[PDB]
Structures are given as structure tokens and as C-alpha cells.
Design a protein around this ligand. Structure first.
Ligand code: CLA
Ligand code: CLA
Ligand code: CLA
Ligand code: CLA
Ligand code: CLA
Ligand code: CLA
Ligand code: CLA
Ligand code: CLA
Ligand SMILES: CC(=CC=C/C(C)=C/C=C/C=C(C)\C=C\C=C(C)\C=C\C1=C(C)CCCC1(C)C)/C=C/C1=C(C)CCCC1(C)C
Ligand SMILES: CCCCCCCCCCCCO[C@H]1O[C@H](CO)[C@@H](O[C@H]2O[C@H](CO)[C@@H](O)[C@H](O)[C@H]2O)[C@H](O)[C@H]1O
Ligand SMILES: CC1=C(C/C=C(\C)CCC[C@H](C)CCC[C@@H](C)CCCC(C)C)C(=O)c2ccccc2C1=O
Lengths: 153, 730, 84
């Protein structure tokens, strides 16, 4: 049958909740700060420059975001379910070996039960604060007064 | 109807004779329903007896205009781009004479393609792109080629919002049937946030990229594609980076400035398109209002308020049904939209807003008559659709005893006056001219009505013109010249190719055209006014809302009982307006060339396209074909074998099509029936006719094929007559 | 900063001039026309005390109270007060 797309008060928000969640680690620059020593800038004006850069260049940029976008909509179809994903191998009874299950988090299950001593002393907050990390570099791209500078100071 | 539903087909209705009123297109065959179907295709007395949808259609079938105006423009930006002449014309204005269109040399074609400027074969333009396009804080042919697809983007998308309505399961009532906010939004931030937004991209970028164009260069020896960011350093030539100010307010010091704006009025010597140093300020000073203004509000309240004695008790309650009409809230609009277009038509020619207009003569009068036919073609409409209200829209009569029920109360009255108004005019408004003939052909000028014989004496001056070009000495601050250079007092020096605007003097031969307008504007409106007013009931027919606002004519009795109705008052009301506008046009160019347009040289001894022939000689209404129609038009009837030629070569057709309208206008109906059978007979003998009962024209369709023709005839005639006497000398 | 810092506080001289003169002028509304200088409701001198307009429209002058002379024809005389 024809593919689906249900609008209803607020899908736009579940996938819009999600869009920013992905962009909250695609925030990148300060989430993984080792990521850019100077990589936030794609490649100053002076700026910095005492290109933008040495580089990691190239082409084959569309093919990626398309081809691995050709996966985003698969963990979105495959696990509609009827399971058989582990096609195993025709012969060979020796394949008990599992790996996990369906994973979200420390894996197959949680695992290695046994825990607490020290580490010691929902979950839209695990969202809310990282747009308060996203939109922040947003103005920090253009983060300048330039002619003048910090009035504050 | 099935097919069959409700609920329980997706299977669409392709096949099974008919739809549209219920002993419908009947099984039994006919032709009339094939002009039916197209006509009244949009309507609402059928589709459903229930509002609901209709607004859910019109907010969609709307959409496909914007998208269209959007597929259009693109082929104009593209066109105004790679079919170039714009690049070539801009380094080289005063000189060129623009093109965008070109043939392909099939058959006779090519004559139509005649050297236009930056070195190429093509057909000219009287549609002032190449001049909005002055803007391009950038320049480049392939660039317009982005603004172009940027156009096709808005479209497909601003055309899939139309899928994303009606066809998608739609909104409903409340959504529009709560009106509460609508203008709040619209005027605030778009009316505002455009004009506003337009400010930001009207000094940022444009001002500078013609501040140092009004001199020389060749583009890209100027205005890069990015250059205009943070680099507030070239913005340095055209005022400070605020230096020491912080967000206006006052603890500011000017020992020598006052931001961009520094208000102008007049005309650039080198590009008299009015100054741009202003053009930001005015749009800024707009938006604010809109920005503040679109913040009313939520609605009755304000109208449910001020009443009086004779005034409007129903003022209070002036329509619940103004959230429940359309045909009403469209008719109102058209009067404004329409009447607010031809107010353009003036502020344009007496105050150009684009670089290179006036000098460009033909590329802003075309305008002033195109914009001019809309501030007219949209007004008779603005009546039609009120007649469409007055007849039907609401369910019952829930609307009662108010402003209207009032106006109607008198009705053989509001239109009782207005009538005499017209015959007072007409006698004082046309036979006035006829005097001259009858007495200048009798010939005794002592007693004509000349700008000189009947007592007026070498001055017009003392009225209000002369207190307009002189007003920068009131509460007025100032700024050299006026507001519109065409005003009485001071100044001259306007332009170094040809001319632009200067005083434009008056008296008589300006006095009385100005009056024919009155009588013309007035008897137009009489027929529409009385037409929409007497929409539904009368003492020739009271049983007279019983079908619709059309209906051919009630019937041979009562004496006549023919025209009546109001489709037809909006049929004989077009018939006039075609004059209303058609003679207003006739006015402007005979003025604007008889005086104004003309030309400088040494001692700037002015030499109008015509040494004021107007003088003593429009006053004669033959002079209007001595000096007009037979004088100019000599360029239309000489135009063969040329480049424009398509005008002279239209000017015969369409000067034919009009003289084909009368056939549709002037004739019976069972006539072309009585005829259509003689035909139908000869048909049957060979065995070649019956199926789909061939029929004559639907009494009022016949009128529909008058009028519409009489206009596309009688009009393009001049559209040709014109473009042929401003291209080439003038 | 700059003089614009003594102007950073001048955001107050308009915005607080505006918004502090705000509430009162819309407070006992549902009123429209009318007041005391017309139709029945009554007592005089004319007066005296009733806010927004009076105090803050006087404060535009007030902002020019102490920065006066210091910005003007720069410093003159030998202590205009006579005291140490
Ligand atoms: C690909 C799609 C598509 C399809 C299959 C349909 C199918 C349908 N639409 Mg529809 N519609 C569409 C896209 C589509 N629509 C879009 C994109 C819009 C908004 C732009 C609409 C807005 C719309 C409305 C308001 C209505 C429908 C209705 C309908 C139903 C009647 C259709 C009909 O016979 O009209 C025939 C008309 C056309 C095929 C042409 C459409 C006109 C526009 C969009 C383009 C033509 C303008 C063009 C420039 C012509 C003038 C210039 C000329 C000189 C060449 C039918 C189920 C009607 C309904 O629900 O039943 C009463 C209802 O009236 N549609
Ligand atoms: C904002 C407004 C606009 C809108 C949205 C409408 C909408 C409507 N009008 Mg309307 N109208 C308008 C402005 C508007 N009008 C104006 C300005 C006038 C004054 C002229 C009118 C005069 C008018 C009348 C008299 C009628 C309507 C009717 C209607 C309704 C029928 C529409 C229809 O079926 O298409 C009709 C369109 C056609 C059938 C296409 C034929 C167009 C021909 C004449 C071509 C025009 C000449 C052109 C140069 C030819 C193309 C080039 C060619 C040489 C190749 C509809 C609700 C009708 C109604 O009954 O109300 C329910 C009624 O007939 N209108
Ligand atoms: C719109 C046009 C109109 C007007 C205003 C005039 C005016 C004139 N024509 Mg004339 N004319 C016209 C159309 C007009 N004509 C036409 C169409 C033709 C050809 C058919 C002519 C052929 C023609 C000829 C051959 C002559 C004239 C002449 C004249 C002049 C003499 C008039 C006269 O003696 O009447 C007598 C005047 C009165 C009895 C005045 C009373 C009428 C007025 C006051 C009515 C006002 C209403 C009232 C004020 C309302 C207020 C209410 C009250 C309670 C206050 C006069 C200037 C003659 C001439 O030589 O002119 C130089 C010459 O005879 N005309
Ligand atoms: C069918 C009839 C017969 C014929 C052949 C004509 C012909 C004409 N009449 Mg006429 N007339 C007639 C009966 C006739 N009349 C009757 C019985 C009356 C009432 C008594 C009149 C009353 C009358 C009047 C008042 C007028 C005319 C005028 C005209 C002429 C217009 C000029 C012209 O067409 O140049 C011929 C050259 C061309 C047509 C070149 C055409 C090239 C262009 C249009 C492009 C090619 C065609 C293309 C398909 C168009 C593009 C459309 C596209 C969108 C599809 C034309 C010669 C008018 C005139 O000019 O002077 C009197 C005037 O208005 N007639
Ligand atoms: C500027 C103009 C314009 C616009 C935006 C529209 C828009 C519309 N017309 Mg329409 N129409 C127009 C000029 C226009 N018309 C003219 C000049 C006529 C001649 C009288 C008609 C005769 C007409 C009829 C008979 C019908 C419509 C209908 C429609 C609607 C149907 C859309 C659809 O079904 O699928 C859109 C389909 C496509 C985009 C497919 C591609 C088709 C080609 C043309 C592109 C849509 C609102 C239908 C209706 O009632 O809806 C209100 C109805 O069938 N029109
Ligand atoms: C508002 C306008 C509309 C109109 C009236 C025209 C008219 C024209 N276009 Mg055009 N065009 C338009 C929108 C329009 N275009 C849009 C939106 C685009 C972008 C897709 C184009 C892209 C385009 C191209 C590429 C060409 C034309 C060409 C033409 C001319 C060739 C005639 C033809 O189309 O059939 C035959 C003709 C003057 C052709 C031309 O200019 O060569 C003479 C050229 O082929 N157009
Ligand atoms: C709504 C409008 C429009 C838009 C989108 C912009 C956008 C911009 N302007 Mg701007 N500007 C506009 C109208 C606009 N302007 C008008 C009408 C004027 C004259 C009254 C100016 C005078 C102006 C100046 C002097 C400067 C800007 C600057 C800027 C840039 C950053 C600072 C800023 O204004 O906002 C974002 C807000 C903050 C960064 C805080 C930004 C690209 C500056 C720049 O070059 O980049 C920093 C600076 O040079 N503008
Ligand atoms: C033809 C008519 C009518 C129109 C459309 C205008 C329009 C204008 N007059 Mg004006 N005026 C008129 C009759 C008219 N006047 C009359 C009858 C008189 C005296 C009898 C004046 C005496 C007058 C003076 C003294 C001034 C104007 C000014 C103006 C302009 C300033 C805009 C403005 O203040 O309001 C804004 C309205 C809208 C935005 C709408 C504007 C062009 C001013 C001017 O232009 O001087 C530089 C000047 O102050 N007028
Ligand atoms: C004869 C003819 C034609 C004619 C024609 C004529 C003789 C005329 C016509 C005309 C047309 C027209 C005319 C149309 C149009 C148009 C247009 C496009 C317009 C536009 C405009 C506008 C925009 C608005 C207003 C103004 C104007 C008009 C400009 C033909 C014939 C034939 C034959 C043989 C057979 C076959 C077919 C044919 C081939 C066809
Ligand atoms: C057309 C019918 C005449 C009725 C109106 C005449 C009254 C005003 C006199 C002429 C009006 C035209 O105005 C025109 O005057 C002069 C023509 O001699 C020209 O004079 C111009 O040429 C010379 C070059 O430096 C100098 O004399 C002037 O400084 C300069 O303004 C101008 O281009 C224009 O200002
Ligand atoms: C001349 C005239 C007619 C006769 C006009 C007619 C019959 C015009 C209709 C002719 C049609 C348009 C011909 C259609 C035939 C073709 C479309 C079919 C072939 C398809 C093409 C490929 C050719 C009337 O019916 C009429 C009615 C009311 C008032 C005045 C008049 C009037 O003046």
C-alpha cells in the first residue's frame, strides 16, 4: 500500500522533539570539544589566520548524507518487526552467540547486575538543556560587535 | 449523486452525464451546457447550500494565483536575464532602448526584431523591469537566473499549499469564522515585515550599489556577491557605523551629520528617478506603522458604538454577516484595491520611484494606462459582486433594520439625485466643447471658450498647486524642490538626455477635460449604483429575486422589461468605464507630450514632442483628431516593414475585433436559431448533424460575447496606437 | 560604556518614563472620554497629586540636573559653594 504520514496536533514535536535531540549532539563543538580545535568553521577575515584550513576537504559529501540517510528510514521499517533479521547461516548448529537484543542503553539488556558502590552521593531535560547548547553557537558564529566590542567590559 | 459513497468509494467520478442543477444535463443532449460549465464554474448556489467548503475552496483556488504570478515573473526575470540587454543597457542607459523578447526567424518573423541597444536584434519593452532591476546591489545575468528559480521555488511549494488545502481534509468554520485577529498579523508584520524587510536590503546593498554607479564603471568593477556583510567599512561612504550613539535615543551629538535618509524630494541630476537616500526612510517610516497598528485587537465594539439621529442605528451591527459573506467582503476590496491602484497611476508620472523613468517616456505610460485600467476594471467588479451580495449570499433575512434597510428606504432617491447631476454635467461637461466647433466653424473667437477668449487672462497659478511647490517653508523642514517637480514654483534643470517633469500648467483645456471626467465618472456609477441598489425588488418587477442577479430580462411586458437585472447594469457599466479610462488615457499623453515630454539642448530651449499644440486646440474636440487621432497614429499607419510593425499589424485586427462586437451586441437570438436550423437541415441531408443539439447563444452569453470583445477590441487598438508613438520620436 | 554608559542608564529615561507612566493610564479604563473637568463628579482645587504625567515628564529635565555644567562650558570658578 501507499506509505503513511500521520499529522495529529503534535507528531510535529515528536519528530520535532527528535530533530533537536540529534542536533544536540550534532551541536558537536562543545559536546565533543576535541572535535574542533578549529573545525566548527567549514572553510576570517582577519579572524583567525594567525583557507580555513589545512583541511579535510572534498566531494563525496552529498553521497554520504544521502546514503546514510538511506538507513535512517530503515530502522523505521525493518523493526516494524516480524523478526528474522538474524538470518544466521543455512547449516551449523553452533550459533548460540547473540550479541545483545534490542539495545537502547548498556546493551542487550542493561547488564552485569551487581553494582553500586560509588558513582555516588524525564529526559526532556536531557533535551531542553542542549538547545541551550545548540542555539548558543548559533549566534556565536556571528558572535561579534567588532567596531567596538564588549560594552559590559 | 453517487456515484455512490458516501463513504465507500475512493473510486473517482470520471464518467456519467452531467452535474449542476438537478434535472441536470439530462441524458438528452445539448450545447448550452458547454458555456455553462466554464461560465459560473465558480459561483455558489450549487456545490452545497452550506458555506463551510466554499471558503475552504477560495483559500486554495486563490493560492494558484500567487503560484502563477510566480511561474510568471520567473519568465520575465529569466528573459530579463539571458535574453539579455539588461547588462548592456545599464553601463549604457540614456543610450539603449531595452529588450527581453526575441522571435526565432520562422516564416515572416524577424521584422519584429529590430536593433535595440547593447548590440542586438529584438522587440522592445514598456514594462519597467530593467528598472526595478536597477536595485541589484550586485548585478549579473546568471544572477537574475537565481532570483528566477527562487521564483519557481515559491511555486510548486506555494502551489502545494493548495494541495495542502481543499484536497487535504481541510480546516473549517471557526478558522475563518473566527475573524478576530486577521488584519492583526497582515498589516503588522509583512505589510510591516516587508517595507521593513525591504528597508534591510534597500540601503544595505542597493543605495551603495547605485550611489557609486551614478557616475560610470562597468559592473564587477563594483558590487560583489557577498562584500556587504560585517564589513560595515564601505557603508562608511554613505554615513557612520553609528560612531558613538547606541540604539537611537538622545544623548547623541551631531557636530556634522544625521544618518542616511537626510530627506530629499526632488530628482538626481544624472538619474532623475527620485532620490534613494530617502527611499529607505519612507519604507522604514511605514512598517513602524503596521508594526505598531497590526496590534489591535482581539470586534463589533467599535462599530457597535457611534450612532445618531438620522445616522446609522444599524451602523451598530453593520454585519454579523461580515464574517459570513465573501461576495460582500470581496466587492468591498475591489472598490479599494481597484481604486487604490489608479492612485498609483498619478504618484508615478508626477513622482517617479525608479531610476531612469520619464526620460524613458514609453516605459512609464504604458504603466500609467495599464495601471489605470485595473483601477477601473476592478471597480465595476467591486459593484458587480455587491449586486451578487444584494441579491443572495446569506441564508434568510437575519441582518435586519439597519444602515442598509436604511439606504434602500430611500433608493428611488439617492439615485434620483445623481441623475440630474449628470445632465447638469454633460451639458456643462461636453456640449461645452461643441460650442467651440459650432462657433469656431462659424468662426468668431471673440466668444469661444479658448484659454484666452472667455475671461481667464495669461495665468492659472493661484490655487493649490502654487501652495504645494512652495510648501517647504511651513511646519515643513524642506529639501530643495518640492515633493513632485510638476508643481508651480521653481526649478527646471531636470535631465541630460531628453527631459522629465516640469510645472505642467492649467486653466481651460485642463479645466474642462477635468470636468468631462466628472460627468464620465458620475454617469458611470449611476448605472452601477442604481443597478446594485435595485438588486432584488422594484416597481417594474417586485417578483424580481426569484432566480439570480443575471437573468436575461423578465419579459416583453411592462413595456420593456429587458435590461433590468444587474449583471446588465454591470454590463452597461463596463460599456461606460471603457470610456472612463479610455478618455483619461487620451488626456495624459496629449498633455504629457504637448507639454512636459520634449527636450533640452543649449540654453535648454525646450522643444516638446509638440510645441504646445494643446493651447487653443483640444478645446475643439476635432483638434482631438486634428491634433490627436489624425496627427499621432500617422506612426501606426506608417509602421509597416519595420520592427514594431506588430502594432500597425495588430491595429487592423482588434480594430476589427471591436467591429465584430456590435454583431454580438446588436442582434436577436431566436435569429441565429432560425438560421442555425437551415444549417441543421442541410446537415441532416448528408447525415452529419443532430447529436449534441446545436443551439444559439444564451441571451446573456450573447451579451457576454459583446462587451468582452468590444473591450479587447476597442482597447488593444490603442495599446497599438500607443506603442508606436513613444518608441520612435517621443 | 563611554558616555553611552551613562546612556545605558538612559534606557530608563525613556523606557521607565514610558512603562512606569504605563499602568495608571490604562488602569481604571473602561472609561473612554470623561474625567473631572466635565460631567458631574466633583472637587477642584484643581489640584495637586495624581501621577504618571507629573513626575516622569519632569524627569527628562531631571536627567540633565547633575550632569549639567560638567558637560557644558567645562569647569570654572573657585568652588561655587565657598565651603572647603
Ligand atoms: C495532481 C492533482 C490533483 C488532482 C488529481 C486533483 C483532483 C481533484 N480536485 Mg484538486 N487541486 C489540486 C491538485 C489536484 N486536484 C491542487 C494542486 C489544488 C490547489 C492549487 C487543487 C484545488 C482544488 C479545489 C478548490 C477543488 C479541487 C477539487 C478536485 C476534484 C475535482 C477536480 C477537477 O475536475 O478540476 C478541474 C480543474 C483542473 C484539472 C485544473 C486546476 C486549475 C489550476 C490548479 C491550474 C490551471 C490554471 C491554468 C493556468 C489555466 C488558465 C490558463 C489557460 C489559458 C491555460 C478532483 C478530485 C474540487 C472538489 O473537491 O470537488 C468539488 C474543488 O473545487 N481541487
Ligand atoms: C477579486 C475578484 C474576482 C474574483 C475572485 C471573482 C470571482 C467570481 N466572479 Mg467576478 N468579477 C470581478 C473580479 C472577481 N470575480 C470583476 C473585477 C468583475 C467586473 C468585470 C467581475 C464581474 C463578474 C460577473 C458579471 C460575474 C462574476 C462572477 C464571479 C463568480 C464566477 C467565476 C467564474 O466562473 O469564472 C468566469 C470566467 C470565465 C468563464 C473565463 C472567461 C474569461 C473571458 C471573458 C476572457 C477575458 C478576455 C481575455 C482578454 C481573453 C484571454 C486572451 C485571449 C484573447 C487568448 C466568481 C465567484 C459571476 C457570477 O455569476 O457569480 C456567482 C458573474 O458572471 N464576476
Ligand atoms: C454645456 C454647455 C452650454 C453652455 C453652458 C452654453 C453657453 C452659452 N452658449 Mg452655447 N451651445 C451649446 C452648449 C452650451 N452653451 C451647444 C451644445 C450648442 C450647439 C447645440 C451651442 C450653440 C451656441 C450658439 C450658436 C451660441 C451659443 C451661445 C452661448 C452663450 C450664450 C448663452 C445665453 O445667452 O443664454 C441665456 C442665459 C440664461 C437665460 C441664463 C439662465 C440659465 C442659467 C442661469 C441656468 C442656471 C441654473 C440655476 C443657476 C440653478 C441655481 C438654482 C437657483 C435657485 C439659485 C453661452 C455662453 C451664444 C454665444 O454667442 O456665446 C458666446 C451663441 O448663441 N451656444
Ligand atoms: C465580416 C465582415 C466585414 C468585413 C470583412 C469587415 C472588415 C472590417 N471592418 Mg467591418 N463591418 C461590417 C462587416 C465587415 N467588416 C458590418 C456589417 C458593419 C456594420 C455596418 C461593420 C462596421 C465596422 C466598423 C465601425 C469598423 C469596421 C472596421 C473593419 C476593419 C478592421 C481593420 C482590419 O481588419 O484590417 C485588416 C488586417 C488585419 C486583420 C491583420 C491581422 C493580423 C493580426 C490580428 C494577427 C493575425 C491573426 C491572429 C489569429 C490574431 C492573434 C490572436 C491569437 C491570440 C489567436 C475590417 C476591414 C473598423 C475599421 O477599421 O474602419 C471602419 C471599424 O471599426 N467595421
Ligand atoms: C488564475 C486562474 C485559475 C486558477 C488559479 C484556477 C483554479 C482552479 N480552477 Mg479554474 N478556470 C480558470 C482560471 C483558473 N482556475 C479559467 C480561465 C477557466 C475557464 C472558465 C476555469 C474553468 C474551471 C472549471 C470548470 C473548474 C475549474 C476548477 C478550478 C479549481 C480546481 C483545481 C484542481 O482540481 O486540480 C489542479 C490540476 C492540475 C494542476 C493539473 C494540470 C492541468 C493543467 C491545466 C496545468 C482550481 C481552484 C474546477 C473547480 O470547480 O474548482 C474550484 C472546475 O473544474 N476551473
Ligand atoms: C510570463 C510569462 C511567460 C510567457 C508569456 C512566456 C513567453 C515566452 N517564453 Mg518563457 N518562460 C516562463 C514564463 C513565460 N514565458 C517561465 C516561468 C520560464 C522558466 C521555466 C520560461 C523559460 C523560457 C525559455 C527557456 C524560453 C522561453 C521562451 C519564451 C518565448 C517562446 C514562446 C513559447 O513559450 O512557446 C514556443 C515566449 C515569448 C523562449 C525564448 O525566449 O526564445 C525566443 C525560450 O525558449 N521561456
Ligand atoms: C530588519 C532588518 C534588516 C536585517 C535582516 C538586518 C540584519 C543585520 N544588520 Mg542591519 N540594518 C537595517 C535593517 C536590517 N539589518 C537597517 C534598516 C539599518 C539602518 C537603520 C541597519 C543598520 C545596520 C548596521 C550599522 C549594522 C547592521 C548590521 C546587521 C547584521 C547584524 C546586526 C543586526 O542588525 O541584527 C542582529 C543583532 C545582533 C547581532 C545584536 C545583520 C546581518 C551590523 C553588521 O554589519 O553585522 C554585525 C551593523 O553593521 N545593520
Ligand atoms: C489635491 C489635494 C490634496 C492632496 C492630495 C494634498 C496632499 C498634500 N498636501 Mg495639501 N493642500 C490641499 C489639498 C491637498 N493636499 C489644499 C486644498 C490646501 C489648501 C487649500 C493644501 C495646503 C497644503 C500645505 C500648506 C501643505 C500641504 C502639503 C501636502 C502634502 C503633505 C502630506 C500630508 O501632510 O498629509 C499626509 C497624508 C497622507 C499620507 C495620505 C501632500 C502632498 C504639505 C506639503 O506637501 O509641503 C511640503 C504642506 O504642508 N498642503
Ligand atoms: C482571419 C484569421 C484570423 C484573424 C484575426 C484577426 C483579424 C484579429 C484577431 C485578433 C486577436 C486578438 C487581438 C487576440 C488577442 C490578444 C491579446 C493577447 C491581447 C492582449 C491585451 C491585453 C494584455 C489586455 C488589453 C490590451 C491587449 C489587447 C494588448 C484566421 C483565419 C484562419 C483561417 C483562414 C482558417 C483556419 C484558421 C485560421 C488560420 C485562424
Ligand atoms: C516655453 C514657454 C516660455 C514660458 C516660460 C518661460 C519663463 C522662464 C524662462 C525659461 C524657462 C526655462 O528654464 C531654463 O532657463 C534657461 C534657458 O534660457 C536655462 O539656463 C541654463 O543655461 C545656462 C548654463 O549655465 C545658464 O544661463 C543657467 O545657469 C542655466 O540654468 C535652463 O536650462 C533653464 O533653467
Ligand atoms: C452572431 C450571434 C450569434 C451566433 C453566434 C454563434 C453561433 C457563435 C458560436 C460559434 C461556436 C463558438 C463555434 C464552435 C465550433 C467549434 C468549437 C467546433 C470545432 C472545433 C475546432 C477544432 C474548430 C448568437 O447566437 C447570438 C446570441 C445572442 C445575442 C447575439 C448573438 C449574435 O450576435
Amino acid at each position: 500500500s501507499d506509505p503513511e504520514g500521520t499529522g495529529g496536533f503534535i507528531e510535529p514535536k515528536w519528530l520535532a522533539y527528535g530533530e533537536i535531540i540529534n542536533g544536540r549532539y550534532a551541536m558537536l563543538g562543545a559536546v565533543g570539544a576535541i572535535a574542533p580545535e578549529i573545525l566548527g568553521k567549514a572553510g576570517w577575515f582577519r579572524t583567525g589566520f594567525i583557507y580555513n584550513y589545512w583541511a579535510d576537504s572534498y566531494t563525496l559529501f552529498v553521497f554520504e548524507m544521502a546514503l546514510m540517510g538511506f538507513a535512517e528510514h530503515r530502522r523505521f521499517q525493518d523493526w516494524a518487526k516480524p523478526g528474522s533479521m538474524g538470518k544466521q547461516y543455512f547449516l551449523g548448529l553452533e550459533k548460540g552467540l547473540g550479541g545483545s537484543g534490542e539495545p537502547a542503553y548498556p546493551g542487550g539488556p542493561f547488564f552485569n547486575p551487581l553494582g553500586f558502590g560509588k558513582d555516588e552521593k524525564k529526559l526532556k531535560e536531557v533535551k531542553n538543556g542542549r538547545l541551550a547548547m545548540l542555539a548558543i553557537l548559533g549566534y556565536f558564529v556571528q558572535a561579534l560587535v567588532t567596531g567596538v566590542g564588549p560594552y559590559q567590559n | 449523486l453517487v456515484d455512490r459513497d458516501p463513504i465507500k468509494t475512493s473510486f473517482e467520478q470520471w464518467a456519467k452525464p452531467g452535474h449542476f442543477s438537478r434535472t441536470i444535463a439530462k441524458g438528452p443532449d445539448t450545447t448550452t451546457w458547454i458555456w455553462n460549465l466554464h461560465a459560473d464554474a465558480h459561483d455558489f448556489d450549487s456545490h452545497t447550500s452550506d458555506l463551510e467548503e466554499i471558503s475552504r475552496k477560495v483559500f486554495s483556488a486563490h493560492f494558484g494565483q500567487l503560484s502563477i504570478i510566480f511561474l510568471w515573473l520567473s519568465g520575465m526575470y529569466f528573459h530579463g536575464a539571458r535574453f539579455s540587454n539588461y547588462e548592456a543597457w545599464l553601463n549604457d542607459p540614456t543610450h539603449i532602448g531595452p529588450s527581453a523578447q526575441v522571435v526565432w526567424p520562422i516564416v515572416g518573423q524577424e521584422i519584429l526584431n529590430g536593433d535595440v541597444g547593447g548590440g542586438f536584434r529584438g522587440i522592445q519593452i514598456t514594462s519597467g523591469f530593467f528598472q526595478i532591476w536597477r536595485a541589484s546591489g550586485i548585478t549579473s545575468e546568471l544572477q537574475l537566473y537565481c532570483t528566477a528559480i527562487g521564483a519557481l521555488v515559491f511555486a510548486g511549494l506555494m502551489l502545494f499549499a493548495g494541495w495542502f488545502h481543499y484536497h487535504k481534509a481541510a480546516p473549517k468554520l471557526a478558522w475563518f469564522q473566527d475573524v478576530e485577529s486577521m488584519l492583526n498579523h497582515h498589516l503588522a508584520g509583512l505589510l510591516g515585515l516587508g517595507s521593513l524587510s525591504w528597508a534591510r536590503h534597500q540601503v544595505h546593498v542597493s543605495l551603495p550599489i547605485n550611489q557609486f554607479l551614478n557616475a560610470g564603471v562597468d559592473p564587477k568593477e563594483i558590487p560583489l556577491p557577498h562584500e556587504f556583510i560585517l564589513n560595515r567599512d564601505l557603508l562608511a561612504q554613505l554615513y557612520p557605523s553609528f560612531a558613538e550613539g547606541a540604539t537611537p535615543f538622545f544623548t547623541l551629538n551631531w557636530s556634522k551629520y544625521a544618518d542616511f535618509l537626510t530627506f530629499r524630494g526632488g530628482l538626481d541630476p544624472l538619474t532623475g528617478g527620485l532620490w534613494l537616500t530617502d527611499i529607505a526612510h519612507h519604507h522604514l517610516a511605514i512598517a513602524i506603522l503596521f508594526l505598531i497598528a497590526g496590534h489591535m485587537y482581539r470586534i463589533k465594539d467599535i462599530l457597535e458604538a457611534h450612532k445618531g439621529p438620522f445616522t446609522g442605528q444599524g451602523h451598530k451591527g453593520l454585519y454579523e454577516i461580515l464574517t459570513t459573506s465573501w461576495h460582500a467582503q470581496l466587492s468591498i476590496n475591489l472598490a479599494m484595491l481597484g481604486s487604490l491602484t489608479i492612485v498609483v497611476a498619478q504618484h508615478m508620472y508626477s513622482m517617479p520611484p525608479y531610476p531612469y523613468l520619464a526620460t524613458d517616456y514609453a516605459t512609464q505610460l504604458s504603466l500609467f494606462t495599464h495601471h489605470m485600467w485595473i483601477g477601473g476594471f476592478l471597480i465595476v467588479g467591486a459593484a458587480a459582486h455587491a449586486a451578487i451580495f444584494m441579491v443572495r449570499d446569506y441564508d434568510p433575512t437575519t441582518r435586519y433594520n439597519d444602515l442598509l434597510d436604511r439606504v434602500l428606504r430611500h433608493r428611488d432617491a439617492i439615485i434620483s439625485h445623481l441623475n440630474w447631476v449628470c445632465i447638469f454635467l454633460g451639458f456643462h461637461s461636453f456640449g461645452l466643447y461643441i460650442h467651440n466647433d459650432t462657433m469656431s466653424a462659424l468662426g468668431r473667437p471673440q466668444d469661444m471658450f479658448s484659454d484666452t477668449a472667455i475671461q481667464l487672462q495669461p495665468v492659472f497659478a493661484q490655487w493649490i498647486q502654487n501652495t504645494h511647490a512652495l510648501a517647504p517653508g511651513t511646519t515643513a523642514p524642506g529639501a530643495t524642490a518640492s515633493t513632485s517637480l510638476t508643481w508651480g514654483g521653481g526649478d527646471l534643470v531636470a535631465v541630460g538626455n531628453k527631459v522629465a517633469l516640469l510645472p505642467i500648467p492649467l486653466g481651460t483645456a485642463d479645466f474642462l477635460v477635468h470636468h468631462i471626467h466628472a460627468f464620465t465618472i458620475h454617469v458611470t456609477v449611476l448605472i452601477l449604483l442604481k443597478g446594485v441598489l435595485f438588486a432584488r425588488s422594484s416597481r417594474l418587477i417586485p417578483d424580481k429575486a426569484n432566480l439570480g442577479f443575471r437573468f436575461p430580462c423578465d419579459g416583453p411586458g411592462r413595456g420593456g422589461t429587458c435590461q433590468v437585472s444587474a449583471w446588465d447594469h454591470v454590463f452597461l457599466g463596463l460599456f461606460w468605464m471603457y470610456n472612463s479610462i479610455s478618455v483619461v488615457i487620451f488626456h495624459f499623453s496629449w498633455k504629457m507630450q504637448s507639454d512636459v515630454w520634449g527636450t533640452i539642448n543649449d540654453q535648454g530651449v525646450v522643444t516638446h514632442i509638440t510645441a504646445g499644440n494643446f493651447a487653443q486646440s483640444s478645446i475643439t474636440i476635432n483638434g482631438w483628431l486634428r491634433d490627436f487621432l489624425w496627427a499621432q497614429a500617422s506612426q501606426v499607419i506608417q509602421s509597416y516593414g519595420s520592427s514594431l510593425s506588430a502594432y500597425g499589424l495588430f491595429f487592423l485586427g482588434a480594430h476589427f475585433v471591436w467591429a465584430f462586437s456590435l454583431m454580438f451586441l446588436f442582434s436577436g437570438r431566436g435569429y441565429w436559431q432560425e438560421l442555425i436550423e437551415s444549417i441543421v437541415w442541410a446537415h441532416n441531408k448528408l447525415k452529419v448533424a443532430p447529436a449534441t443539439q446545436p443551439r444559439a447563444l444564451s441571451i446573456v452569453q450573447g451579451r457576454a460575447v459583446g462587451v468582452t470583445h468590444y473591450l479587447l477590441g476597442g482597447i488593444a487598438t490603442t495599446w497599438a496606437f500607443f506603442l508606436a508613438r513613444i518608441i520612435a520620436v517621443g | 560604556d563611554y558616555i553611552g554608559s551613562s546612556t545605558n542608564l538612559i534606557m530608563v529615561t525613556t523606557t521607565t518614563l514610558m512603562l512606569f507612566a504605563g499602568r495608571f493610564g490604562l488602569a481604571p479604563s473602561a472609561n473612554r472620554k470623561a474625567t473631572a473637568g466635565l460631567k458631574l463628579e466633583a472637587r477642584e482645587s484643581g489640584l495637586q497629586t495624581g501621577d504618571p504625567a507629573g513626575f516622569t515628564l519632569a524627569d527628562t529635565l531631571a536627567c540633565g540636573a547633575v550632569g549639567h555644567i560638567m558637560g557644558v562650558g567645562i569647569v570654572l570658578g573657585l568652588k561655587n559653594t565657598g565651603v572647603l
